[PDB]
């Protein structure tokens, strides 16, 4: 697909930066910015989740094809480390691609450090 | 591995869970199919698969903090990928983070090259 079929208005707002995708894997970068700060001055959990959801969505698209659609049914995330500056990278991998649903996992890292880990389910449209 | 008696409970025995190995923040447990594990569809019940996962995750935590310390499950989330009708399954759990107060752990259940279930949970360090 073109860059266009992989971004949305919200992904652009948060500052998500897709890096690569293919065979049920995707990687997306997110630089820290002032508007991502929570009350403690670190990257907001919502921003981290947003990053993960988008990366998972792109991984799914790479599995079933961009000529087909899937949507998030549910997702679960754990927050492991705070992010105060710099950038993070999220990598998502499709673990199962069924006729009706896909299971996807993802991790967010800063350098080698684990920042967040998640797992979710997508509905195949 | 410590003695088997140190790694099992009445409930793990009931289900038929069988510790296989322990590493540094990693554990493997096996579960053979049996009549009393069947759900209404005649396959391994989701509860039995979850029980396997929870036990394996606990053992992975113990291999991280030591069996001289304790942790308990705060929460867990599991996805069921496909049904198991016979034979046995293996669960491997891996500690992803060991903090002073909590641990995050992931686990997968397989039968060979078949992914059966996948999950992620949080333990409280006691």
From TrEMBL, chain A:
It holds the Pfam family 4HBT. The keyword Repeat does not apply. It comes from the Bacteria. Keywords: Hydrolase. GO terms for molecular function: acyl-CoA hydrolase activity. Residues 40-114 form the Thioesterase domain. Gene3D superfamilies: Hotdog Thioesterase. This is Thioesterase domain-containing protein. It comes from Pseudomonas aeruginosa (strain ATCC 15692 / DSM 22644 / CIP 104116 / JCM 14847 / LMG 12228 / 1C / PRS 101 / PAO1).
TrEMBL record, chain B:
The keyword Hydrolase applies. One of its GO terms (molecular function) is acyl-CoA hydrolase activity. SUPFAM superfamilies: Thioesterase/thiol ester dehydrase-isomerase (SSF54637). InterPro entries: Acyl-CoA_thioesterase_PaaI (IPR052723), HotDog_dom_sf (IPR029069), PAAI_dom (IPR003736), Thioestr_dom (IPR006683). The keyword Hydrolase applies. Keywords: Hydrolase. Pfam families: 4HBT. It comes from the Bacteria. Residues 41-115 form the Thioesterase domain. NCBIfam families: unchar_dom_1. PANTHER family: ACYL-COENZYME A THIOESTERASE PAAI. This is Thioesterase domain-containing protein. It comes from Pseudomonas aeruginosa (strain ATCC 15692 / DSM 22644 / CIP 104116 / JCM 14847 / LMG 12228 / 1C / PRS 101 / PAO1).
């Amino acid at each position: 697909p073109a860059r266009e079929q992989m971004i949305s208005a919200y992904s652009e707002l948060v500052g998500l930066d897709p890096v690569s995708l293919g065979d049920g894997v995707a990687e997306v970068r997110l630089p820290m910015a002032a508007h991502l700060r929570n009350r403690g001055g670190v990257m907001h959990g919502g921003a981290l989740f947003s990053l993960m959801d988008v990366t998972m969505g792109l991984a799914c698209s790479s599995s079933h094809g961009f000529d087909r659609q899937s949507v998030t049914l549910e997702c679960k995330i754990n927050y492991i480390r705070a992010v105060a500056d710099g950038e993070v990278r999220c990598v998502a991998r499709v673990l199962h691609a069924g006729r009706r649903s896909l299971v996807v996992e993802a991790e967010v890292r800063q350098g080698d450090k684990l920042v967040a880990k998640g797992q979710g389910t997508f509905a195949q449209l």
